[PDB]
Amino acid sequence: SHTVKIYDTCIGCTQCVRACPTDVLEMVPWDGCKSGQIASSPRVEDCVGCKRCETACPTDFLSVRVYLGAETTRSLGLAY
Amino acid sequence: AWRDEVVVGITAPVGFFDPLGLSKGKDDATMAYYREAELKNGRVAMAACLGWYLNAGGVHPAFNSELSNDPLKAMVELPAVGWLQFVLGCGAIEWLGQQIKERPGYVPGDLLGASYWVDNSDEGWVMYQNKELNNGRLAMLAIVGMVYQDVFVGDYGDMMYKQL
């Protein structure tokens, strides 16, 4: 459904993965930052488009960007 | 045996009341018919009582209050079309009731199917049921008394508590 992309400016603060309401983001090993960790979006099929993740990023400009797109039952948050 | 299981209807003033023993040899089915009849006759009586009281009081705000305050006179004044609807409507409900009766687990008198949620184990349930029966029994006698007063004595209002 929606598209979430992570950029090299990430600092591995883990704040984004701790804010997702649907477990779409994970922290994976990396060497480009001091923390030695980067964020990934393995399960974008469950993204609802809340953008809470973006609100949590501390980088000058979001290192995590959510681009809204095709809509499915899951993305539209339909319990019915 | 109905006598060995029945719990509702047996109260304090007199306990089990069958002076003429009209239920000694009756089977469960006959006894069930009796209880259903008792409840129905009583419930209808309670309603009739309220109706009579309202009309007698003068609160009959229908047909521009044209009909008489005397309940028995009013019935004569009512068009037949009104009566036909009444009988037919009640008849319809009677049919539905028969359907409910056939369904397994029917407790004589229960049309709401309260058996689904509550049983006679609950004392509150049995007590409230007793209140319906007791008030119904009283109402039956009352409606019969009132008619006598209106048809013979000549009055259709309270002749007991009216004297403040």
Binding site: - | V81, L96, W117
Partner: protein, 146 residues
């Protein structure tokens, strides 16, 4: 005593067993309605439903329509009812096409194309005929006086 319980004893389904939802009265009435009754064929189900809905629809038009005070008011009311029935029938036809498709197999399941078509047909006949019956009845109203 609790008169409200989880439906079907499932504490997590979105429904509750209230006296209104599950009482002998409600169960009995719904079981014997033409829509859910057992044994009725698709055509007969539609017929009963149509007969019922057509009879009560002539009233509103006949007594409150544009030509209510005209001598031909009842006739006009009948025509209006027939028009409404046609609109409703179009809806039924269209619904069936979209919901069921084009070729069916199960059969005798109100929820199939063939069964739905039969159901629709019954509704039309029953509704129009019922409206006609009301026309005949309303032509001369009995006073039931002796």
């Amino acid at each position: 005593a609790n008169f409200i319980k989880p439906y079907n004893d499932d504490p997590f389904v979105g429904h509750l067993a209230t006296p209104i939802t599950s009482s002998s009265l409600t169960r009995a009435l719904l079981k014997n309605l033409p829509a859910y009754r057992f044994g009725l064929t698709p055509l007969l189900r539609g017929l009963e439903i149509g007969l019922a809905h057509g009879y009560f629809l002539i009233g509103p038009f006949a007594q409150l329509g544009p030509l209510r005070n005209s001598d031909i008011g009842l006739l006009a009311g009948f025509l209006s009812t027939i028009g409404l029935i046609l609109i409703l029938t179009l809806g039924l036809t269209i619904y069936g096409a979209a919901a069921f498709g084009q070729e069916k197999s199960n059969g005798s399941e109100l929820q199939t194309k063939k069964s739905w078509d039969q159901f629709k047909g019954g509704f039309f006949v029953g509704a129009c005929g019922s409206a006609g019956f009301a026309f005949i009845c309303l032509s001369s109203i009995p006073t039931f006086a002796l």
